[PDB]
Design a protein around this nucleic acid. Structure first.
Length: 69
RNA sequence: ACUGAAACGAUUGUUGUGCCCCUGGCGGUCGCUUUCAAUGCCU
């Protein structure tokens, strides 16, 4: 009742791991946190599919472990 | 292998050493064991 599904350009505003990013997502802008074993994004603008899970955050859809490999 | 696996800010150490509750101090001052009494009664 409070999530919805959409597609377009979105500011993620949660952290997000670039290694887990699939095709049908692309990263347009990112700000990064340099960290072992691999750096995260702390903020990113993406193009692709998402879930607006409350009226002020947008979560990337379709992420899975190591999807860039 | 959770940027992972194990992971003692630890060991030793006296709040110590010296110190007089001390000095001065009249239980003092006043006070009648007092008041009355037949060695007596007779030979």
């Amino acid at each position: 009742d409070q999530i919805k599904t959409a597609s377009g350009v979105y500011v993620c505003n949660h952290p997000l791991n670039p290694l887990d990013c699939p095709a049908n997502q692309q990263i347009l802008l990112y700000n990064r946190v340099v960290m072992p074993p691999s750096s995260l994004f702390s903020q990113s603008q993406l193009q692709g599919d998402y879930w607006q899970i409350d009226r002020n955050t947008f979560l990337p859809q379709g992420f899975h472990y190591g999807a860039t490999t």
